Amino acid sequence: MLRRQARERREYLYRKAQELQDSQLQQKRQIIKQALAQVDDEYAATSGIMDPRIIVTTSRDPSTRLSQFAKEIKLLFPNAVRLNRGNYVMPNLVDACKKSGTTDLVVLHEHRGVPTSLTISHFPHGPTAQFSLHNVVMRHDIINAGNQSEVNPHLIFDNFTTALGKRVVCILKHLFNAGPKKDSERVITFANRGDFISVRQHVYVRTREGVEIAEVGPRFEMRLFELRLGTLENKDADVEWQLRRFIRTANKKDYL
Amino acid sequence: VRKLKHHEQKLLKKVDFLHRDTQVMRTYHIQNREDYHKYNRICGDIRRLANKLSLLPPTDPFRRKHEQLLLDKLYAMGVLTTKSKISDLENKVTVSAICRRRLPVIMHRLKMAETIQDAVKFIEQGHVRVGPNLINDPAYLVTRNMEDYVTWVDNSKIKKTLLRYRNQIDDFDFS
Amino acid sequence: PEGRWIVSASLDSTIRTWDLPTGGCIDGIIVDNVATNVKFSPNGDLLATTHVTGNGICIWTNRAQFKTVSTRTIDESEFLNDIDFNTYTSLEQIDKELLTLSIGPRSKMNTLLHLDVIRKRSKPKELPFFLQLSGEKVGDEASVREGIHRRDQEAQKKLDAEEQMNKFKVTGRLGFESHFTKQLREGSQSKDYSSLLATLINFSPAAVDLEIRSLNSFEPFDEIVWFIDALTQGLKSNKNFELYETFMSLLFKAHGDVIHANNKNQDIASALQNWEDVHKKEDRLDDLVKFCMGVAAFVTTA
Amino acid sequence: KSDFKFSNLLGTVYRQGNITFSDDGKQLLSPVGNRVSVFDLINNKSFTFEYEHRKNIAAIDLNKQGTLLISIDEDGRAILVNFKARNVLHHFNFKEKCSAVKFSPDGRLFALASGRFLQIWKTPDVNKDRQFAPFVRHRVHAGHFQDITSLTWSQDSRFILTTSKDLSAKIWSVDSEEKNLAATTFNGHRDYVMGAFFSHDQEKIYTVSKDGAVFVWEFTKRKYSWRITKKHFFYANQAKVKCVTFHPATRLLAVGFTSGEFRLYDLPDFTLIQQLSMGQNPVNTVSVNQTGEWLAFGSSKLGQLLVYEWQSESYILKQQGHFDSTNSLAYSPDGSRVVTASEDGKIKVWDITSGFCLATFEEHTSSVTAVQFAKRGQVMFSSSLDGTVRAWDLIRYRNFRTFTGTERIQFNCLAVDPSGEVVCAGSLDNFDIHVWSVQTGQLLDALSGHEGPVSCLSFSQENSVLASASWDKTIRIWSIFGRSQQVEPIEVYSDVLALSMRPDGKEVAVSTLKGQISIFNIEDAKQVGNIDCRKDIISGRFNQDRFTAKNSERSKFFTTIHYSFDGMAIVAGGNNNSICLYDVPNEVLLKRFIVSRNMALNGTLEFLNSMRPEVRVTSVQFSPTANAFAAASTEGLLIYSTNDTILFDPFDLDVDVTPHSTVEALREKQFLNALVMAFRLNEEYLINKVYEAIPIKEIPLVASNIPAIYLPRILKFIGDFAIESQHIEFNLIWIKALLSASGGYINEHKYLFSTAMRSIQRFIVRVAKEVVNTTTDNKYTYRFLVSTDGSM
Amino acid sequence: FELSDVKSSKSLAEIYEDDYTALSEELQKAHSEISELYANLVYKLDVLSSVHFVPKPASTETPTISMEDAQPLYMSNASSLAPQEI
Amino acid sequence: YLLVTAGETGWLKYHDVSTGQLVSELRTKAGPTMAMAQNPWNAVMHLGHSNGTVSLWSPSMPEPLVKLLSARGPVNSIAIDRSGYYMATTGADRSMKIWDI
């Protein structure tokens, strides 16, 4: 089985290299496409066929505020289960998740009660995105307001342009649930404003004239800063994209 | 027959009734000229079947379903490792690809035996197995899942000296 | 090795064989040398004995293996036949009140019921110089716009049957009256159809269906009345009850329309009345089967 | 209990060589690769002979008086057996490869076409005691130039026609004087000669060629000798005559070509009575009944056998064995049907009572790997390497739903819910148990949790839980119903590869790769205990080996387990040459059978005398009648049974319990006492005698007075006697009386009367319900035909 | 479809007799040829990659008998049809 | 350098062994060729059929050059002098013929 995982990660590396070369070939062929006149590989194998399942888990010995926030993310997603890592090593954690059969993992990290990091991993040797999440506001932080409606939610993505934006929107799209209802009530919005994407839950009713939304759920701006090829057990897998901080144009470059 | 000289050579330049076959027999240690002929004839059947399935009209549900059936079968066989093209079926299938899917090449690839003929000799003596049961013939194109589960047979002296060099013998499993 | 006999050799120069069920010596042999050892082969065929003189080991065979053996205590005699051969055939019929089925296979009834569909499913599988085309096939759309072989196949089938009839031309002189109808007519004369029941049970199923379908159905209905009389007598006789009722079902299959049209004739009505008398007597098997199936299912479930 | 005789072989109706009829014609003897099968055609039964051979049978002949059978393999080894006792009388060794055998119609002597010689031997006696050396040569003729390809006797035992590939037909005689009369040859012929037959008056000699020509010789005049009187010709494109047989008394010629066409002619007029094709494969042998009405056509390519009645054009039988190997087995919940599955996809359904092929199904493409039933006689599920799993009815014989995954992944093992609502299949390339629901059709779930492929699945059928055993060296007990979805992982020492659960549903036996069969208690997930198996396995040596058959771990384990229906025994069969029957509570083997002695199959010999078809047992199961177990192996489905009951197994005997005392109790009219004595003695003839002896009006008293110790045995006995007993009224009175007397006892010990109730309701459903069905049908048809108004 | 600019190998009487007399016969024969070739290929591959002995599959007018029958031979077709589907 | 291969289906194949090539392939209409010998001075082939006739063949033309009714039944054997003048045939009806070729 270890030989199985080694062989499959080697084939996955080759497939990602082939997809990169063919995407450069498509960028070459696009110039011809305007003279005469699609999803990723893993999310293509399981695009709309199977519905995903996620495990949202704490970092380690978490505070009550972080556990409340993990419960909040579990309530945001559909088909989520909350997991309290205590004395789970990371290899045994991802091994148990692979063995159980789980579409993805979301592990959280905080600082003195304030969440600051969130790493998502797709499990059949899929990619891991590490986001830094800053401006957290929880439902627990707001008020006793009821409960999340938990219906299969609609999705909204604003201002995702480059290939990095396509990667991120595909990752988050397939974290969500596939094939929602037309009159599905709650909509999750992913706004992009200069590398600081922001998410909000919103319920909406169509009035006698227009729409009227109520803001609920969590409220936080996250920002990607790593996208590794292998799963998060490795810490030696190749990096597909890495946020550069000590470069000259660091305070001006967007999507970098 | 006698390395006939110049003038008799020009008179009888075609009489010899007595080298890719011996080439692959040297480099990847195949058994037989007839073994190479078998693999090459098999690739010939694949080529002829490809030409006939192209001759069938391309907008045919029967043609496309039989084509993808053959593609998935050959991928399960593992002689090729991609799925997306048909030009890889008309060109990428080689005698070298099937002879590398052969068993002792897989053992040398998984670094079990250091040399190909040593892999052959271990298969003769009966020190390997594939899943539940053991294998005695070298001409054995191992499938994908079964090369994933190939290993030594238990309680064999080679596995004993493996675990002895690693100093991790465990005679409760009579390793 | 079957554990039914003990063979004991003893210093009175004897070898005895005891049957253990009856606890008695069934065989006794007086040998010259005292047999100091006796064993059986693990397969029950050889008996290996060693004596006090003779460097070999005598071997003996087993007529009990190749035959039956009378079990009578004859030890002192030297020096219920079902019991003595320890085999027991079953009785044919226990009592006249008891139902019985046919001595034979259990597929005969289903074969007799469904032999015709067996035929239908077991049959095997397999130019003029002056052409005559029509106004659409040739370009005659005027005749189209003012447009104004099954019998050949029927005649062809007549020709193939004629080919079969002229093909078979055996001139062997055969009897006029067949054996079945002769025995039936004799049974009707004797007012007892026991021999007819005998040959009916002993018939082959294809012969049964061919004869039953090729009964004669005229205005006096003599043959059909005799057949129903025979089946009533048989159901009173209470043997091969399955076969007699499947015979009557086959009769209603073949000659149903004729007997239905000529219903209410007094002779056929009285014959069917006797039939219904015996059948109404017979319904207790339906009763017992329903009870036993119900209780058995209830016990194995709850 | 612990004894099992080799009773039957299913599949491969005909394998190689001569097929013969009997004298009475009620039996057809057919060669299977090692043994000889007797198909009884009047009473619809099958039988197989218990003696094996050394190699494949090449020739067979039965004596005219129905007493002796000679069977010659490929090397002169000839076993000569008796019928009416079914034992091997002798076995001789004719050293040269014998071509054919025939018994003279006097029976005193038998001819033997061997090599190019013709040998003629006398036959030993049967009523004579077994002698040491009973064989004696009578004559050897050597007048051919090539091999004798056919043999025929005359109607009197005086003349023998040998037909040989020297284009020759030779008349020899058995006597010197008649040799001087006619030691005559017959030349002037085309490619080969395939038969030579005397006419009924024996003035005419027909010869049938391989080219397609029949020459009618006749002893006529031009001081005159054997003119070719007439020539008839068949006409086929390329089809050559491969088998001929001529029944003289009804002048029937039956020929079988190489294109599957067989033709029936009447010979002297040479008319074509009929012409039918059996397939695309050559018809290999033809036999005729004595009465000429029945014909037997064996084709050895697919192993198909036809028995025809050309009079009424009726197929008495048309079976065809499996081609490759019976890959899987499944009994019926009652035991009447046994379904099998090949490496080809042809799923067959055999009947047991008449050992025949009721049905087949060709809807799979590749090898069917497992076949199971439900706890109902309706459905049968089958899973193949195709990437699918289909669901068959056995009342309408049709698919319902071909369940699959999404990526067309190859299913090995199968399991069904006891109620019949959930179908689980375990692949090998995915190690996820897929679970479909039956009535909806779409898959419920993909149970994940193994690492490495699922090796076996099953459902314990009371709690309705499922064990999944896999090459992660684990068992995993899932409970999937009722909001929980919970898992119990048990580890073992090695790779597991077979599983079975108790009929009570408390324990699981798992046969692993080391050769130990462990047995676990489910509710504790603990180990009740294991039985070793690495010693008592008789592995075979291979002819292409480089090691010994002792230090080889080629087949040192058991890849198939099944329980008993008492939960007390275990059959184990693997790739080896042995079938082991263990007993669980004492943890020790009860029996070991050797599957086949055949040097042609690979894994048979232990040490060779100084690719090829290996022998291996695919799957073993018991019978729900608990008197038999079946083994699907590479030759076929062998069936071992205990219907012999030749064994004095008593039960709590005393000094006064004799059969004479039992009959004395019958005269004493102490019927309960006589029945208890008979069940103490446990001798089935005596039990039948007393059981039919006691009368009706005391059956309820006796059934109320039968003790609880003897209740399960009298239940099983009445069941297995009422199946083949014509006293259905008596048996139903007995069953009703026993159920009236003791029903609560059976409700409280339902597990103990399992096989008893199985067999009894099998009897009622199978033979009683059809009878009352026909009774009801006739009653209502009479009511209709008399009650309503007539026509016209 | 596509026309043929070659000379028609049949006369008017032959083409009108043809019109006077599976989608296409050549297509069906192509299906037979490719099916037998694929059967031979899968046989060769199972010979190579299998563990146990596998035989050759098969070999590739008149009244014919079908030996294997996918019904118990005494079950009528109307009786096999369900009462819902009729 | 020519390898004659008379067989059973009724057939005769001249196969050159130097170039390695089937030079001639003739079908024998009569039947399975029971006997065969070569005339060495002429280097032609003599077959002996099931009819009782010998037949003289060459790798050029697809008919026999000559046919001789020698005996009845099949011809068991034939032999030819080194000079290529006399033939001796034996046939299964207890017959022997001494021919001048």
Contact: chain E with chain A (3+ CB pairs below 8 Å): no
Asked if B81's CB is within 8 angstroms of A3's CB, the reply is no
> Alpha-carbon distance C231 to C254, whole Å?
16
H or E, element range at B109: helix B103-109
The token pair at D676 is 């208890």
| Helices D659-668 and D671-681, packing angle to 10 deg | 170
Q: Is D88 helix (H, G, I), strand (E, B) or coil?
A: strand
All residues of chain B having their beta carbon less than 8 Å from the beta carbon of residue A4 are 148
The 8-class DSSP code of residue D80 comes to E
The 8-class DSSP code of residue D542 comes to P
Q: Is D593 helix (H, G, I), strand (E, B) or coil?
A: strand
Residue C126 distance to chain E (closest CA, Å): 4
> Alpha-carbon distance C273 to A186, whole Å?
81
* DSSP collapsed to 3 states, chain C: CCCCEEEEEECCCEEEEEECCCCEEEEEEECCCCCCEEEECCCCCCEEEECCCCCCCEEECCCCCCCCCCCCCCHHHHCCHHHHCCCCCCCCCCCCCCCCCCCCCCCHHHHHHCHHHHHHHHCCCCCCCCCCCCCCCCCCHHHHHCCCCHHHHHHHHHHHHHHHHHHCCCCCCCCCCCHHHHHHHHHHHHCCCHHHHHHHHHCCHHHHHHHHHCCCCCCCCHHHHHHHHHHHHHHHHCCCHHHHHHHHHHHHHHCHHHHHHCCCCHHHHHHHHHHHHHHHHHCHHHHHHHHHHHHHHHHHHC
Question: For A11, which residue in chain B has the nearest alpha carbon?
Answer: B81
> Alpha-carbon distance C81 to D466, whole Å?
57
Nearest residue, CB atoms, D406 vs list A1, A49, A99: A49
Asked if D359's CB is within 8 angstroms of E71's CB, the reply is yes
Nearest to A218 by CA among A164, A141, A120, A161: A141
Q: Tally helices (H) and strands (E) across chain D.
A: 10, 55
Say if D147 is an interface residue toward chain F (CB within 8 Å). no
Asked if E67's CB is within 8 angstroms of D306's CB, the reply is yes
Mutate to test the interface with B, among D404, D496, D513 (most CBs of B within 10 A): D513
Nearest residue, CB atoms, D732 vs list C206, C292, C299: C292
> Alpha-carbon distance A233 to C297, whole Å?
59
> Alpha-carbon distance A70 to A201, whole Å?
16
CB burial string D558-587: b at 16+ within 10 A, e below? bbbbbbbbbbebbbbbbbbbbbbbbbbeee
Nearest residue, CB atoms, B53 vs list E34, E40, E51: E34
The token pair at D378 is 């309706």
Say if B81 is an interface residue toward chain A (CB within 8 Å). yes
> Alpha-carbon distance C302 to E13, whole Å?
81
> Alpha-carbon distance D702 to A33, whole Å?
97
Nearest residue, CB atoms, E75 vs list D276, D360, D397: D397
Residue D429 distance to chain B (closest CA, Å): 7
Mutate to test the interface with D, among F33, F49, F50 (most CBs of D within 10 A): F50
Question: For D444, which residue in chain A has the nearest alpha carbon?
Answer: A50
Alpha helices in B12-60 (DSSP H): 20-27, 33-55
Which positions ≥6 away from D146 have C-beta within 8 Å? D116, D164, D165, D166
Contact: chain C with chain B (3+ CB pairs below 8 Å): no
Task: Kindly tell me the sign of the dihedral angle through the C-alpha atoms of D418, D424, D425, D426.
Answer: negative
Alpha helices in D428-499 (DSSP H): none
The 8-class DSSP code of residue D524 comes to T
Judge residue A197's burial from the number of C-beta atoms within 10 Å of its C-beta, 0-12 exposed, 13-18 middle, 19 or more buried: buried
> Alpha-carbon distance D783 to D295, whole Å?
45
CA atoms within 13 A on the CB side of D305: 27
Phi, psi at residue B107, to the nearest 5°? -65, -45
| Helices D684-693 and D671-681, packing angle to 10 deg | 170
B vs D, Cβ pairs < 8 A, gives 40
Nearest to B134 by CA among B159, B111, B114: B159
H or E, element range at B63: helix B61-77
Q: What angle do CA D324, D325, D330 make, to 5 degrees?
A: 135
Residue D330: how many other CB atoms lie within 10 Å: 23
All residues of chain F having their beta carbon less than 8 Å from the beta carbon of residue B17 are 17-20
Say if A235 is an interface residue toward chain B (CB within 8 Å). no
> Alpha-carbon distance D765 to A193, whole Å?
77
Task: Kindly tell me the sign of the dihedral angle through the C-alpha atoms of B87, B91, B92, B98.
Answer: positive
> Is residue D485 a contact partner of residue D476, using CB atoms and an 8 Å limit?
no
Asked if C124's CB is within 8 angstroms of E73's CB, the reply is no
> Alpha-carbon distance D179 to D197, whole Å?
18
> Alpha-carbon distance A13 to D225, whole Å?
91
Asked if B14's CB is within 8 angstroms of F17's CB, the reply is no
> Is residue D749 a contact partner of residue C223, using CB atoms and an 8 Å limit?
no
Residue E81: how many other CB atoms lie within 10 Å: 12
Indicate the pairing of strand A186-193 with strand A154-158: parallel
What is the DSSP track for D720-784? HHHHT-S-HHHHHHHHHHHHHH-SHHHHHTTTTTHHHHHHHHHHIIIIIHHHHHHHHHHHHHHHH
* DSSP collapsed to 3 states, chain A: CHHHHHHHHHHHHHHHHHHHHHHHHHHHHHHHHHHHCCCCCHHHHCCCCCCCCEEEECCCCCCHHHHHHHHHHHHHCCCEEEECCCCCCHHHHHHHHHHHCCCEEEEEEEECCEEEEEEEEECCCCCEEEEEECCCECHHHHCCCCCCCCCCCEEEEECCCCHHHHHHHHHHHHHCCCCCCCCCCEEEEEEEECCEEEEEEEEEEECCCCEEEEEEEEEEEEEEEEEECCCCCCCCCCEEEECCCCCCCCCCCCCC
The token pair at C206 is 């294809």
> Is residue D391 a contact partner of residue D438, using CB atoms and an 8 Å limit?
yes
Nearest to D568 by CA among D490, D509, D492, D496: D509
A vs D, Cβ pairs < 8 A, gives 15
What are the Cα distances from residue D735, in Å, to D129, D703, D715, D743, D759? 47, 9, 8, 11, 12
Residue D466 distance to chain B (closest CA, Å): 23
Asked if D557's CB is within 8 angstroms of B132's CB, the reply is yes
F: neighbours with 3+ CB pairs under 8 Å? B, D
Asked if D659's CB is within 8 angstroms of C242's CB, the reply is no
Indicate the pairing of strand D148-153 with strand F86-91: unpaired
Contact: chain F with chain A (3+ CB pairs below 8 Å): no
All residues of chain A having their beta carbon less than 8 Å from the beta carbon of residue B110 are 3
Asked if C124's CB is within 8 angstroms of E65's CB, the reply is yes
Nearest to A47 by CA among A174, A226, A155: A174
> Alpha-carbon distance D763 to D756, whole Å?
11
> Is residue A152 a contact partner of residue A143, using CB atoms and an 8 Å limit?
no
> Is residue B148 a contact partner of residue A3, using CB atoms and an 8 Å limit?
yes
What are the Cα distances from residue C156, in Å, to A236, C132, C160? 86, 21, 6
Residue D150: how many other CB atoms lie within 10 Å: 25
> Is residue D366 a contact partner of residue D408, using CB atoms and an 8 Å limit?
no
Indicate the pairing of strand D252-256 with strand D243-247: antiparallel
All residues of chain E having their beta carbon less than 8 Å from the beta carbon of residue C106 are none
The token pair at A120 is 């998502």
Mutate to test the interface with A, among D448, D470, D487 (most CBs of A within 10 A): D448
Mutate to test the interface with F, among B11, B14, B18 (most CBs of F within 10 A): B14
C: neighbours with 3+ CB pairs under 8 Å? D, E
All residues of chain F having their beta carbon less than 8 Å from the beta carbon of residue B15 are 18-19
H or E, element range at D423: strand D422-427
Asked if B148's CB is within 8 angstroms of A7's CB, the reply is yes
The token pair at D673 is 């006492």
The token pair at E71 is 């019904």
Note the Cα D788 to chain centre separation in Å: 51
Q: What angle do CA D291, D293, D298 make, to 5 degrees?
A: 110
H or E, element range at E19: helix E12-20
All residues of chain C having their beta carbon less than 8 Å from the beta carbon of residue E76 are 114, 117
CA atoms within 13 A on the CB side of A47: 7
Asked if C21's CB is within 8 angstroms of D648's CB, the reply is yes
Mutate to test the interface with C, among E12, E17, E69, E74 (most CBs of C within 10 A): E74
Q: Is D363 helix (H, G, I), strand (E, B) or coil?
A: coil
Which positions ≥6 away from A28 have C-beta within 8 Å? none
All residues of chain D having their beta carbon less than 8 Å from the beta carbon of residue E55 are 323-324
Q: What angle do CA C116, C120, C124 make, to 5 degrees?
A: 140
> Alpha-carbon distance A43 to A45, whole Å?
5
Mutate to test the interface with A, among B75, B80, B82 (most CBs of A within 10 A): B82
The residue behind tokens 């170039």 is F19
Q: Is B6 helix (H, G, I), strand (E, B) or coil?
A: helix
Asked if D493's CB is within 8 angstroms of B132's CB, the reply is no
> Is residue D727 a contact partner of residue C98, using CB atoms and an 8 Å limit?
yes
Residue D119 distance to chain F (closest CA, Å): 22
Phi, psi at residue B74, to the nearest 5°? -70, -30
Rounded to a whole number of angstroms, the CA Rg of chain B reads 22
A vs B, Cβ pairs < 8 A, gives 5
Indicate the pairing of strand A54-57 with strand A80-83: parallel
All residues of chain C having their beta carbon less than 8 Å from the beta carbon of residue E13 are 131
Indicate the pairing of strand D465-470 with strand D474-479: antiparallel
Q: C58 has which bridge partners? A: C49
Nearest to D83 by CA among C1, C66, C87: C66
What are the Cα distances from residue D472, in Å, to C129, D451, D494? 79, 6, 8
Q: Which amino acid is at E25?
A: E
Mutate to test the interface with D, among B122, B144, B154 (most CBs of D within 10 A): B154
Nearest to A225 by CA among A125, A145, A147, A119: A119
What are the Cα distances from residue D614, in Å, to A15, B103, D14, D162, E77? 42, 21, 20, 38, 42
All residues of chain A having their beta carbon less than 8 Å from the beta carbon of residue D470 are none
The region, left, alpha or beta by phi > 0 then psi within -120 to 50, assigned to residue A125 is left
Asked if B148's CB is within 8 angstroms of A3's CB, the reply is yes
> Alpha-carbon distance D35 to D638, whole Å?
12
Residue B47 distance to chain D (closest CA, Å): 24
Indicate the pairing of strand D328-331 with strand D337-341: antiparallel
> Alpha-carbon distance D643 to A25, whole Å?
76
The token pair at D195 is 């038969």
All residues of chain B having their beta carbon less than 8 Å from the beta carbon of residue E24 are none
Q: Is E12 helix (H, G, I), strand (E, B) or coil?
A: helix
Question: For D734, which residue in chain C has the nearest alpha carbon?
Answer: C292
H or E, element range at B125: helix B116-125
CA atoms within 13 A on the CB side of A117: 13
Asked if C138's CB is within 8 angstroms of E16's CB, the reply is yes
> Is residue B40 a contact partner of residue B46, using CB atoms and an 8 Å limit?
no
What is the DSSP track for D690-733? HHHHS-STTHHHHHHHS-TTTHHHHHHHHHHHHHT-S-HHHHHH
The token pair at B82 is 């991609």
Q: D297 has which bridge partners? A: D286, D306
> Is residue B112 a contact partner of residue E80, using CB atoms and an 8 Å limit?
no
